[model samples]
Structure formats: C-alpha cells, structure tokens
Target chain A: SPGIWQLDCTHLEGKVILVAVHVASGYIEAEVIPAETGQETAYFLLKLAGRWPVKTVHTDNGSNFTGATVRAACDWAGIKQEESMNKELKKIIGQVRDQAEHLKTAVQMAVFIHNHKRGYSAGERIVDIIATD
Target chain B: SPGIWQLDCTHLEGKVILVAVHVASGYIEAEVIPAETGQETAYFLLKLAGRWPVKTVHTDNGSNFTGATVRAACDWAGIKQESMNKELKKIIGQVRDQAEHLKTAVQMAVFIHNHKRGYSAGERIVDIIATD
Candidate 1:
C-alpha cells in the first residue's frame, strides 16, 4: 500500500541533482543541491514529506544516502530507503537541461518542461500521470 | 574522445557495487568485488580497463580509492583518479541478490542501464553523474 520511487542523484555539468522517479507514472522530482551527502538527501526527503505520497524510496548502497538527515526524514515521512530506475530519469534530465529557452537557468527550466510539456501517455508527461489519481 | 568516469564502492544491503559512470552518456560499468578496499577497487579497475577506457576516473578523497593496488590498476589502465559522483548509489541499490555470481547481477544492471533510451532532442540517447 506504499508508493515506490527510485531515488538517486547525478552531476549535470557541475550541479548535483537529487532525483526521484515514481515507479508507475515515470513521473520524477529532482533538484540541484550543494553536495551529495546524507544530509543533502535527507533535506530533499524531508521537504517532500507529507507533500508527496512516497512511503518507500529505493536507493543503492552508497554512504551518501545514509546517516542523520535520511533517518530524520525517514521517520517523519514514513519513508523507507532501499538500495534502487535511474536511466529513464537521467536521460530525461539531460534533455530538460538542453531544450532551454526563456528561463533564468536551464536546470530549473527543464524540470517544468519535463513535468508539463513532456509528460502524459503518448506525451509521457509525469505530472499528467499523477493527476489522474 | 573518450569520456571521464568516477569509480567508487558502496556496501548496499551488505553488497558492494564497484561502480563507474561515464560523464557523457551516463553509461556505466559496475561489478561486485569481494570487499570495499583498495585492492578490490583495483581488481575492478583492471577488469574494466580493457573493455572501457578508464584513463580518467573519479572518487572521493578517501584512501580507499587511492591506494597502491588501485595505483597499480591506474597505471595499467592509465586511469587518472580525480574526485567523485553519487548516481552509482541509486544503481546499486536496485540490484537483486539473485545472481549465482553477484557480479552477474552487477553486469546485468549495468547493461540494462546503458541500453535504456534517453532524451536527445528528437533522438534517443543514453547516460549520470557527479565530478565535483
């Protein structure tokens, strides 16, 4: 009865992205953070607490995904971190960053494009998938 | 030109994914070594050295990714250890322990990841990663 997400991070150019992709819709949530540490991931997790319906987040066995912050968020959100689908995400991330137009930065711009324009069936828009339920 | 990669290890659910991700294409090559020490990383490097051009690799500041055995593999593959990345963690987190040889699962995962279609404007491409 828990929503599953594959959580991971990546470096685009030089920015670090904490990304989460929903298992069913291929919908994803990502952000650029300062570093790839447990604290950073934890902060990302807690921000989504209550807001997102994630009960379990699957991840790889990297030390960065463990530690204080993750636990704090884990308990607060009732999120379970496990060891993790990232190809679909990373692939899309690169494009979102690429097709940039009138945004202050492409990183932030891409997120909107991916969720709105590039989403739904046939369209494969992530936001569309989540809205149905 | 050949792309750069970051090599590192992690003990996820009691298994270590000796993994590397190409800076471009986000392509990866990973294996399950016996341990998380320098020797194990070196062995992984040496094995991957031939198939992939690991002349430039990255990892954290820890000695684990920088010891002599790893140095040996570096020289053998002409790998230059730089700094690190974290996407490997997500990949390793998903491997099922169903492989007769854990390395098999690692390879299978790597293949699956590399082959997945990615966005490249109209065309589909392949690749994560961190360098700083």
Candidate 2:
C-alpha cells in the first residue's frame, strides 16, 4: 500500500493536490491543479486506483481519503478499503461503461443534428442515405 | 430499419426538416424545424434510417435531397447515397454501476455515522459518481 498520497498545503492557492503512484510499477503523476478540494481528492484517488492497476497508496490522516476520498477510490478499485461496506466495487464497473455510452450517444446525436442541419454543403443527397417508409 | 425521413422544402424554409416514418407497417409523423440545412438532412436521415427501422420515402429534389443534403444524410444513415468513403457509424454505450455502488455504500455509511455522531436527525450524503 505504498503509492501516492494526498498532500495539504496551507499556503498553496488550491486547497488540495493529488499525488498518484503505482505500487509495484512505481509510476507517479503529481497534479497541483485547482479543483473542488474535497471532491478533487476523492476523484483523484478513484482515477489513480480505479483507472490504473494500483494496489496501494500512502497518505497520512488528512481527512481527504479517510473520509470521502478513500471510500470513493476503494469503491471503484474493488478493494476492501473500508470495513463497514460489504458491496464490492468490481460489481459496478459495467454500470459505468453503460452510462458513459448513453451520455456519449445522446450528446453526439444532439451535435450531429445541430451541425448537419446548418447547410454546410458536401454536395450530397439525403435520399441516398435515408429511405422514407 | 423503419424510422423517420428527412424532408426538404422551398416554401417551408431553406433549412431541411425531419419526418418520422415506420417501415414494416406504415406509421408517419412530421416535424418542421430549422436544422443544419446540409448536415441536418443527413442526420435526420440517419435518425430515420439508422436509429429505427425505415424504408422508402417520396421526395422531390428542391436542392435538399439531391445536393449536399443527400450526401450528408446518406453518410450518416449508412446507405448507398454516394460513391466515396463508406464507413458505418460507431456508437458506444456506458453504465457506471460500480460508482453507483460505491456511492450507495458511502452514503449509507455517512448517514449512519451522522446519526451516530448526532450531526442531524436525518441527513443525506451524495457520493462522487464519476471522476476524470
């Protein structure tokens, strides 16, 4: 469980910074960007562990992961980061994929409708593609 | 597939409109809205042809179906509308059940903790759904 840790800087502009690390690989990506301090920490942990194959990370008690960050990260990582919750994160990965596609499709359809109707000519015909019933 | 059809009109508007048409049987619906004159026709055609099941439509070429409108609509609809590059449209769907489970656990825990700690008589906690 040795990877990235969330660091708190009283003097920094943003409230929190993300320190990402790979447990066995030792890969690291540290980002010091302004994000919703509380949400950012939780999100960073999820991205670090959920997206990449991360085993463990090291962080002191900063109220970030101990509270929301840890739960969120572990939820996505499918690890028993918390004891009280019995539901495993692995069970919900498919849900994420499905929701993403729905959102993406809706947005793409909207944009396509908006742009295609604008009359930017590519010198084609509509009938050739779409048949009326 | 049976769905809707894109319609073009000179008196209606320079912009193309969408007409929903069902194929297997005959169910028809029409809507006149200003869409991307060129791309709109193509997209409308796609929605009509690709999204649902649709068959033949009857239209006269007032520059809506015979020109750019025809080409754009055909490409997205995936029909033999032109003789250039032919590629089927790709659509991907997603569901975030894991995040939802995580959220449910966090929320339930927070609720219990809040109750135990005497934060509120009954409170609600929203968990992070997705993280980029």
Candidate 3:
C-alpha cells in the first residue's frame, strides 16, 4: 500500500486516499476515506479481498497499519502483512498529487496508464505481462 | 526512526515513544512522545543530529517520514533519506517488539546489545564496529 494522504482541495481538503499496488502485475486499487483509521484500512482490504484473493500485504509502519484491529483482520483472512522497504509505490503516488478533487477517478486513470502505457524493465506493458502469465 | 506505539502494558496504555537506530553501529536512541507526527519525527532526528553527524537515514515509507516539513529539515541538514529492504529490518523489529516496557527498554536493549552482548559472540561491540 502507498499509504494514505490528504487530498489537496477544499471540498476534499481533509479526506485521504489509500492506494494499493500489485507489484508483479502493476495493478492498482485505491479508495477515498474520511481519515486514515484502522476501520477504514480494514474496509479497504475487505473490499479488495472480495475482488481478489489477497495473500500478502506490504505497508509502512503507520498506526493504522499496525493497529490490533487491522492485524487481527489480516490474520483472519490469511494474509501475511509486512512493511514495505522501498519507495516504488510512493514515487507513483507523487506523480498524481495534483489530482485531488476527483482523486478516485484520477487514481483509476493512473492505474489504467500504468497497466496500458508504462513499460517495465523488459520493455513490455504491465497488462500484457499479466495476460501472458 | 521506527515510529511510535503503545508499549503493550497496563500502565503505559496511552503513552507512546519514538525510536531511532544507527544502521551501522546498531546504536539505538529512543524517547517517549505524545504522538506520532511530523514534528515529533523531526525532533528525534534533530536530537540525533546534535549527537552524531547523520549522513543518511533509512526508514519504511511512513507519513511522518514523508511530510514536506520533515523533508525540508532533512534537506537543510543535508541528510539523505532512503528506505530499508528485506529481513535486514526484521532483526531490529524483533528486538523492540520484545522490549515493550517503560518504553525506554528499547534504549537499554540497544545499548546492551551494541556494547556488551554483541551481534555475534566475542565479536567487537557496535561502538568498536562503528569506529573501525
């Protein structure tokens, strides 16, 4: 997960968005929440789990991530939660900081671009790599 | 800095502490803080920079570590920041998790481990390892 951040706008001034990325496929899942709370984090994971079977989750050592409620939920879901050690996801988030009004849409577009337009080390689109896999 | 957390205690229920560890020497510095915020994180590094000249810092990607204020301070101090990788961090993680008391337990454990117990038996202390 790229973690949560306040969107830079008036109407959504204090609201935050949580982002998750599939490292291998470059798939992104994001959501807007009132604040970065354990409940919101759990809700995000629960929604993601409904769509895809999550095996492992990597995140920073935020209180929301380290809270007992989130930990218990992940344990129940059989997901191994670990802290991320790099800035790959953060760098991606940095590129889209300007889109705060419709962050949800912006994030979805970012995911689409990442899947369809971005190139990996082997010079192949992420969507193509996932398709062949 | 490894961030703040409740010390898993009855008395320390609401209290939180901040921690900083030297990657090379295994030296640890910790302090109790009111909350986890950009201000507190900056204070921890400020105290550390006063004691030792910090050239680089590695951390997990956290909000406290990401805020613009903290970034500007680090830039002013000429300290390069990076994130960690793999089980290299897990070792330090285990140590603090085990020391959930007085919150300063982490500081004592850090000092004892780096100075006396040593990472490997009969190996040089972290202080020596840092010097040489």
Question: TM-scores of the models, in the given order?
Answer: 0.41, 0.27, 0.35
Q: Provide the RMSD of all predictions against the true structure, rounded to 1 decimal.
A: 18.4, 21.2, 21.5
Error of 1 at A30 (Å): 0.5
True contacts kept of each: 0.00, 0.00, 0.00
Question: Which is the winner by DockQ between candidate 2 and candidate 3?
Answer: 2
State which candidate has the highest TM-score: 1
Interface RMSD of 1: 18.8
Model 3 lDDT per residue over A57-96, tens place:
7676577877876775566445677512014433444576
Cα lDDT, model 2, residue B113: 25
TM-score rank, highest first? 1, 3, 2
What DockQ do you compute for every candidate structure? 0.01, 0.03, 0.01
What is the DockQ score of candidate 3, to 2 decimals? 0.01
Which segments of model 1 are wrong by more than 4 Å? A83-104, A118-133, B1-132
Candidate 2 chain A — worst ten consecutive residues by lDDT sum?
Answer: A82-91
lDDT of 1 by residue, A32-114 (tens): 67788876676566544323356788886588865865676577457777612245545555565443331113443344334
lDDT by residue for model 2 (A12-89), tens: 222333434333322233333345354555655543432222344555546555566556556655544311001111
Point out the higher-scoring one by lDDT: 2 or 3. 3
TM-score between model 2 and native: 0.27
Q: Sort the candidates on lDDT, descending order.
A: 1, 3, 2
**Which segments of candidate 2 are over 4 A away from where they belong?**
A1-15, A23-26, A33-36, A80-133, B1-93, B96-132
